[PDB]
């Protein structure tokens, strides 16, 4: 069962935000990216978005987002995002997205409506971490198994929680309009609004679905009308004003927490050894940059660590006490000389 | 500024010090140790009884 997991985010709504770079410029968008985390080894990254996923206006793959206070929905396979190459969206749940695509320097996320394209790009570093000691850029078809950390594919109630807050007052210039001589305020049906003005003196009025006109005001730009909502909490976003008083009403769990799993890691080619009197030579040919670590079995190791990305030649000396080395991810190889 | 001081190992008594500066007024220090513990690092081997 998963509806009990989804129940937490039925209590919230999407929210408009500011994003520095839409397709035009400094902009207000529904897809503002708050933060990005890239700690998993296989390129799995977590995006914290301003929209909601998996909830209809319960459906599998959809994006639920906000338009000047009006909630709208789109199929999930329309939105895209990229850093340097086209990324791939896996799944979404609430304010979080799990993505799998290679390294880069900026995150761009975009989608296309019937005629208007929405997008923006944020410059937060995304890093690709190789496992083991064989640097690569795309995981291999075959190799061996290791234990690294990858981000879990499914949602569950973990010990990590976030905080919501009571929403603030949202100014909307659309509500206010000019009558013949007064200012007309038309709050939306089934919701309350707050009108504050200084056209004459200080004014404050809570209207509840009432079309009221105020005297002494001629132009409309003098003053403002807001929107009030009690339910449908919002995340502790830094891009919003806060409400009045203690701003705390619970917390929600964060899915897609990291976990331990089995990892495919490449295997380097076998180095060809040639032996001589108290010495060894390693004919060597790497497919990718790889680490040599070499040690002696005496009181002092003379440990040597080296990164090689080209064919090369190395001649090592070995004594009776012993020599040991690791190339790539092979088990360590120990050689022990003999009198001759 | 570094200042070294010596403390007798005995609780129940006060101890006064003055930190002297050539160009500034002396600074007082008052110290009273209340309780000192000498805890040993002990391991468990076995237990016996009737």
């Amino acid at each position: 069962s998963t509806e009990e997991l989804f129940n937490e985010y039925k209590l919230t709504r999407p929210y408009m935000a500011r994003c520095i770079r839409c397709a035009v410029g400094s902009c207000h968008s529904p897809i503002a990216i708050e933060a990005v985390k890239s700690d998993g080894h296989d390129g799995y990254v977590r995006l914290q978005t301003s929209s909601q996923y998996g909830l209809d206006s319960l459906k599998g793959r959809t994006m639920r987002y906000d338009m000047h206070g009006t909630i709208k929905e789109i199929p999930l396979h329309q939105v895209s995002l990229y850093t340097s190459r086209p990324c791939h969206i896996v799944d979404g749940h609430g304010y979080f997205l799990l993505a799998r695509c290679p390294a880069g320097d900026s995150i761009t996320m975009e989608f296309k409506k019937d005629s208007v394209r929405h997008s923006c790009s944020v410059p937060y570093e995304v890093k690709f971490n190789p496992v083991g000691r064989e640097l690569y850029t795309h995981p291999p078809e075959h190799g061996v198994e290791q234990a690294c950390q990858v981000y879990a594919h499914d949602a569950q109630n973990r010990g990590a929680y976030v905080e919501m807050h009571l929403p603030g007052s949202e100014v909307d210039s659309s509500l206010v309009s000019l009558s013949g001589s007064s200012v007309t305020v038309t709050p939306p049906d089934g919701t309350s609004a707050l009108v504050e003005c200084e056209c004459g003196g200080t004014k404050i009025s809570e209207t509840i679905n009432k079309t009221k006109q105020f005297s002494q005001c001629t132009k409309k730009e003098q003053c403002r009308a807001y929107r009030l909502q009690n339910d449908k909490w919002v995340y502790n976003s830094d891009k919003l004003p806060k409400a009045a008083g203690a701003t705390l009403k619970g917390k929600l769990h964060v899915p897609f927490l990291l976990a331990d799993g089995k990892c495919t890691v490449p295997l380097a080619p076998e180095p060809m050894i040639t032996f001589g009197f108290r010495s060894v030579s390693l004919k060597l040919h790497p497919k990718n940059p790889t680490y040599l670590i070499t040690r002696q079995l005496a009181d002092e190791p003379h440990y040597t660590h080296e990164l090689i990305s080209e064919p090369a030649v190395r001649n090592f000396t070995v004594t009776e006490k012993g020599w040991e080395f690791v190339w790539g991810n092979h088990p360590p190889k120990r050689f022990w000389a003999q009198e001759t | 500024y570094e200042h070294a001081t010596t403390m007798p190992s005995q609780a129940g008594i006060s101890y006064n010090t003055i930190v002297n500066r050539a160009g500034y007024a002396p600074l007082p220090i008052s110290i009273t140790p209340t309780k000192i513990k000498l805890i040993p690092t002990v391991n468990l081997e076995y237990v016996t009884c009737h």
Partner: nanobody
């Protein structure tokens, strides 16, 4: 010297629900890592569960069928099992790592209990 005592388990039919309990006793005050490990015959040891304070972890083949709860006050970890499969036949061990002795002579880091055998019949 801290020791871990395991209890629970036993014989059951396919689809049953059991409980495993591991308790820590000795010169300990606070514990960090509660974990469970399973070892089937002819195979190496593997992790099944991992609990540490509020966080809990699960392996790939065991999601949605095992639940882990830790009580730091009693320093016990309880593993609730539901809807068991014939692949679950193995001996289960409980692990404790990151032990904080209350001075509390510093000693071995990790400890191990005897474990319990769990067998489900098809």
């Amino acid at each position: 010297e801290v020791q871990l005592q395991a209890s629970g388990g036993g014989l059951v039919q396919a689809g049953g629900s059991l409980r495993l309990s591991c308790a820590a006793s000795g010169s300990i005050v606070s514990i960090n890592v509660m974990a469970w490990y399973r070892q089937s015959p002819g195979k190496e040891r593997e992790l099944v569960a991992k609990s540490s304070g509020p966080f809990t972890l699960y392996a790939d083949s065991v999601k949605g069928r095992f639940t882990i709860s830790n009580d730091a006050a009693k320093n016990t970890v309880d593993l609730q099992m539901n809807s068991l499969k014939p692949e679950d036949t193995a001996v289960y061990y409980c692990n404790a790592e990151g032990l904080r002795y209350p001075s509390g002579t510093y000693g071995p880091s990790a400890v191990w209990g005897q474990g319990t055998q769990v067998t489900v019949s098809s």
